[PDB]
């Protein structure tokens, strides 16, 4: 099986490398993560929370992470250039809470004591693209407020806060709702807007959960009572639309078995999202993904990184 032959038989094209972000495309970086290395990372189910994680498996430029003390059914894959993972000790030097291994208390945990007990190695610092040493997203301070699409109820644009800032990204939280709605952004995110956007647009603004007299929510009053400032309007940047076109081919991580990466096709497109189809499979498995998601790649990515590529289901 080769891309060349397949693109020949299917009279098709891959999405050009130049349509992807550098981080989605890069193949020449070695994976320096090793089995059993320990580190800190975001829980994909609770994006505001940080946990101790151990390298459980490595495949090409990808690694499987395991939550120390918890069940192996929570393991997840990331790329070796993930910004969502950090070296041991990062939480304390940067103002982040670390959830201890299952069974520990928070001040019963130290890295030096834990590495002694486990006889494990911390993943070396030079492996991590994100250590809170890069330029911050200009204008986005912790505690500032903004309006944001609830991506889990995306008809709603809502009162939101910046709750975390790490290198070039920041964490959006929906005031008085739980953290499961939190998501990480940069200043060009198409899902976020300055305070006052909804009313300039003539769109309803969803106030904090159970806010008194929700219809008469007023930004100026809410800001004053919470002792908060709005993110300034100049900090918000326009992201240009992607240029992926229908039928272009690429490589995508399987959401149903994320250890796999499959031959894929652009099935449909929006300004900032693409609908993926896995060639050879039911359209029931098709799915929308943001164009900047870390789990889509140009053709050749698997080959060049040392990851198996799943070829289309044949007859």
């Amino acid at each position: 099986w080769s891309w060349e032959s397949y693109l020949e038989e299917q009279k098709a094209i891959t999405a050009p490398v130049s349509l992807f972000q550098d981080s989605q495309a890069v193949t020449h970086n070695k994976n320096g993560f090793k089995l059993g290395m320990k580190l800190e990372g975001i829980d994909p189910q609770h994006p505001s929370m940080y946990f101790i994680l151990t390298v459980a498996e490595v495949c090409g430029y990808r690694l499987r992470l395991h939550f120390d003390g918890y069940s192996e059914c929570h393991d997840f894959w990331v790329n070796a250039n993930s910004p969502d993972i950090h070296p041991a000790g990062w939480f304390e030097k940067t103002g982040h809470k670390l959830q201890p291994p299952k069974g520990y208390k928070e001040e019963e945990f130290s890295w030096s004591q834990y590495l002694r007990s486990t006889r494990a190695q911390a993943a070396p610092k030079h492996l991590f693209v994100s250590q809170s040493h890069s330029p911050p997203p200009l204008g986005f301070q912790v505690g500032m407020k903004l309006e944001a699409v609830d991506r889990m109820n995306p008809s709603l644009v809502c009162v939101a806060s910046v709750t975390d800032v790490v290198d070039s990204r920041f964490l959006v939280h929906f005031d008085n709702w739980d953290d499961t709605y939190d998501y990480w952004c940069d200043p060009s995110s198409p899902y976020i807007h300055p305070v006052g956007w909804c009313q300039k647009q003539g769109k309803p603004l969803t106030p904090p959960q159970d806010y008194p007299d929700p219809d008469n929510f007023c930004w100026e009053k809410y800001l004053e009572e919470t002792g908060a400032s709005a993110v300034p309007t100049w900090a918000f940047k326009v992201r240009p639309p992607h240029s992926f076109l229908v039928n272009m081919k690429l490589e995508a991580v399987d959401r149903r078995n994320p250890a796999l990466i499959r031959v894929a096709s652009v099935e449909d497109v929006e300004d900032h999202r693409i609908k993926i189809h896995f060639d050879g499979w039911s359209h029931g498995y098709d799915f929308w993904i943001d164009a900047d998601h870390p789990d889509i790649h140009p053709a050749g990515w698997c080959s060049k990184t040392g990851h198996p590529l799943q070829p289309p289901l044949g007859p």
Binding site: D150, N153, L156
Partner: peptide, 9 residues
């Protein structure tokens, strides 16, 4: 996983 829903509690 429940969507946002208008309720009266």
């Amino acid at each position: 996983r429940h969507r946002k829903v208008l309720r009266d509690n």
